[PDB]
Amino acid sequence: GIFPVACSDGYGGLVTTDPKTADPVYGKVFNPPRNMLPGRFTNLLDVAEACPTFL
Amino acid sequence: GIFPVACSDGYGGLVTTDPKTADPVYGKVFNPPRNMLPGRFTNLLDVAEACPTFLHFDGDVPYVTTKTDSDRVLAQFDLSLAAKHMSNTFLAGLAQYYTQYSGTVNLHFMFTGPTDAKARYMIAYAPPGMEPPKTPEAAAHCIHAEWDTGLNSKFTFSIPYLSAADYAYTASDAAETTNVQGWVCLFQITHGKAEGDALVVLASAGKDFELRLPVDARQ
Amino acid sequence: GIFPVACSDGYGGLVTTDPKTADPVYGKVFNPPRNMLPGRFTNLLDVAEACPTFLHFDGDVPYVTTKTDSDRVLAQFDLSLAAKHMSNTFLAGLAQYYTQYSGTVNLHFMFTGPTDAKARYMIAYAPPGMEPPKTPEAAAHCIHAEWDTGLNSKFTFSIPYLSAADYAYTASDAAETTNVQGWVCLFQITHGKAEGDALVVLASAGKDFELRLPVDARQ
Amino acid sequence: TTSTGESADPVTATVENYGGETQVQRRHHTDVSFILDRFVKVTPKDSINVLDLMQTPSHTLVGALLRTATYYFADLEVAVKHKGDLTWVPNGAPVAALDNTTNPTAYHKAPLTRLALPYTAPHRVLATVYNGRPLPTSFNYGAIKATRVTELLYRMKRAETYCPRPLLAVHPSAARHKQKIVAP
Amino acid sequence: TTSTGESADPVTATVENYGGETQVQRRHHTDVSFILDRFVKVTPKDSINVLDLMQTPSHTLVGALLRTATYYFADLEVAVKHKGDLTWVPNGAPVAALDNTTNPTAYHKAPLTRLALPYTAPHRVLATVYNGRPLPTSFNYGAIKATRVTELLYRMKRAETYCPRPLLAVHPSAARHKQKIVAP
Amino acid sequence: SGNTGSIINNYYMQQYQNSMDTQLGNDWFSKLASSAFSGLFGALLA
Amino acid sequence: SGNTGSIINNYYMQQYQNSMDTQLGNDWFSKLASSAFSGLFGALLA
Amino acid sequence: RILTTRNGHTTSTTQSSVGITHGYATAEDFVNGPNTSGLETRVVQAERFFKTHLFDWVTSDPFGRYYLLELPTDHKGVYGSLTDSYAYMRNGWDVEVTAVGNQFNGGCLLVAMVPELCSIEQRELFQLTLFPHQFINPRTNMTAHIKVPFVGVNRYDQYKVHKPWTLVVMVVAPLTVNTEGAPQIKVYANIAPTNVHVAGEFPSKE
């Protein structure tokens, strides 16, 4: 035969924040090299610690 | 029990370009051996580098004839792959199926005139932001090359890829009044007895020419 | 949570020839031991190589009789597996279920006449593109063999597979006026006292005969 | 290449006689197990259908190639489109059994239902032709019943054939058999 | 950089002549196998549709790039939206075969049906242009039949191309070809 | 052996998916076709 | 080789998913484009 | 720049020559295929030049003037007889084209071996350089020389119903005499088959 499976209820509905990836349509593109551009911040708190603002 | 699973929403819909394979219906066939047939090309750019093709000019001829008058501008056109001049080339043939490109585009010049006629030419690249030059003396400040006729009949000139963004659109947007990639200009410095003699021009990809993001634009 | 998954569109529809197995309902049965029964064949071509079968001729007889007249053409027919002559063979029996074939098709000849009669025959292959030969002298330029009667009653001749494309269609297309694979021609060179004596002919696959792409054509 | 035809020993002459060279063969597509593994249509009956490989039409690719062997063995895969609940029964079981859900029963799930069935007959190997027109009742894989069955398919698995038999083609009226071949 | 133009030997001058520096190239998007692998629409016919790559429009990205090579090879993936049961037939098989469920047949399962098909032609490699307007009937992947087919798509796999041919762009009337480009 | 395209092991035991064979105690036709005589019966000339 | 995104092995044998190639006995254009002459034909000055 | 080409017992010599252009491959693919059962043979005596006229290239011809020549053509030598005695053939082409004015003529020609040439579009000529070619520029060379293998969807072809190669000669620049040149230039071709192989003898007419 073939590998049996059980489609479960209450699973699979789309979730806006869900942690999984879309199926790629269109492949093999290369980006223009962006390495070491100035002024990068990976976390929105670090810019909050290093740049005080007015009251 | 049996292994449970969750059928997820928004997945599984068919995608024309999707990266997965159909379920085989009908098996165990063998092909007639095709190994080492002649003239194979695995990439559509390699055939663009190794086989230059003609341009297009007024009168619908792939050459420009020497002229005697105060006007030394031999031919002048936008640098784009949507230009009318490039339209007949193979190189501008692939472009219409891709959105963006980068790299060098080579131009080939071959002087057709008789052995008793001599001429000297100038090709130049006019970057965007200013009107292109109308005189060789004005163009002499740009990037340019200069060659004349002789034993060798052919000259090859590499048009640099010079732009702010690492890639440039192939198509020409309707809201673009002036070319973004600038112009290239071909001048005739002078000619010995060359009146009515033809210069055929060719175009092909360079070493670093790169083309990406396929799209079906109709056309 | 639980392992997420994406149900994909365009997959899972049933395919009559698909390569996968049903879910077993009812288990733990044992077969009566069948090991080493006689007369097994695992491939339908092997039975085609080891068991030649008769052809079909006018009067619906699987043989052709010697003739005395200016006409030495004994039998002549298309090389195809859709021919009327081949129609009764086992070899042309399998063909109708496959689209394409390649390789050699063997013909077997057995002279049935009495011990006091002697004849000499010619088989020849006429490739496509020209009308097939009407006289042995015309055919002598083709590929041919020649044999006569004697102690051994049987002769075997391999008809080559010779074509542009590595495979050839079994069926005969209605828009085909002239056979694509050419003809084979059987001649009678001469006969001692052989009037009214029969030559039975047989056909079977060769060593390299290969048959592929199954199809259900009705029939 | 001359020999004694009455011997019946197989004699295969080759092109090397007049100076040719024999080429390479790939016979996968004529393999018995390969060629017979696929679905073939059978005209069903409204409710009870006995699973029998001889119901396949004789001119179909699976039907014809089957009938060329006196003695055949294989498993079975069925593909059925039906209403209600498809109930299967093993060989030699009473007809009154098809009404019991205890026997294997596939509840209706669209579009159709595919099963895999073992070789259930008592005989070591079945037969296409039997000398005794009718074939003995013991040749069958069992039967299936449903409220109604719209389509039925057979797919043989692990096919094995024995003692080949004639295989006939269509007899042309003209010198060739001319059909319209797919063309652009 | 001067040379003899009549040689036809490729000559690529570089920016280093007047003092530039050549940059790095990434050509993945122009790779033949990469660029030709995707679906392209073909206007179907109600019932029988012969699978042929030349039916693709010449101006489409897959159609145009196909026609630039005289000799091409590839497998095929189809995506079909149809009513009834989609039946496929290998190359060179009679048209009367499309009516047999024994041949590969995909029962209707919404929204559509995707198959993967092998290269079935006898010729070692197919051709976009043939010298003999018509192309020989032997160039095709076979045909498909259904009660009706609403849409049809072709996707080439493992594409291989040989002997390139002209590829033309649209010829502007003005000095440039000006189109409206996507903008916010 | 037949037409099967799975490169991964079948989900169900071999004992279920198929019927189990037993033993007791192309076989014939390929061994027949392999014995075909390809030679020339008489002396060869040229 | 083409556009394929699966990092896991295809579920069906290579023999089914694709047609099997055979042998007998960018190839040309890349070997052509790699021979392009980038040099200067005459003597260089400055 | 002297070049001597010998095929069979025939030769050609050119004092003004730009060299040879090898189309699509340097050497023939596999000759012996599965489809002929090894019954193919090589014909040595068939490889040699033969000459034919193309056209007369005059000032009035504008850009785009083109001349198709399909190969093989009608041939009265040994190579012609083969086509009637054998149902399957293959071969490569070694092509040479010669247009002689003097060095004071002007204009240019483009010769190319185009496989499977059917109704090329006018605009498509601007890209015609994609195929193997050489320019004839009377300023420099009087001779164009091209070598190409056998191409086709079959390993052997039937030259009755199929012509794989087509020689095409196009005017990229119109002729100019400038009073010191030849008034018009005649174009000839010198062509030889290569690597001919045949199979499948026909019967005769008798």
Author numbering:
A (entry chain 3): 1 to 55
B (entry chain 3), C (entry chain 3): 1 to 219
D (entry chain 1), E (entry chain 1): 1 to 132, 157 to 208
F (entry chain 4), G (entry chain 4): 15 to 39, 65 to 85
H (entry chain 2): 13 to 218
Paper text:
Foot-and-mouth disease (FMD) is a global disease of cloven-hoofed animals, highly infectious, and antigenically variable, which poses a major threat to the animal industry and causes enormous economic losses. FMD virus (FMDV) is a member of the Aphthovirus genus within the Picornaviridae family. It is approximately 30 nm in diameter, forms an icosahedral structure with a sedimentation coefficient of 146S, and consists of 60 copies of each of the capsid proteins VP1 to VP4 (9).
FMD serotype O is more thermolabile than other serotypes. However, strains from other serotypes most often contain threonine (Thr) at VP1 position 13 (serotypes A, C, Asia 1, and SAT). Icosahedral reconstruction of particles was achieved at resolutions of 3.1 Å and 3.6 Å, respectively.
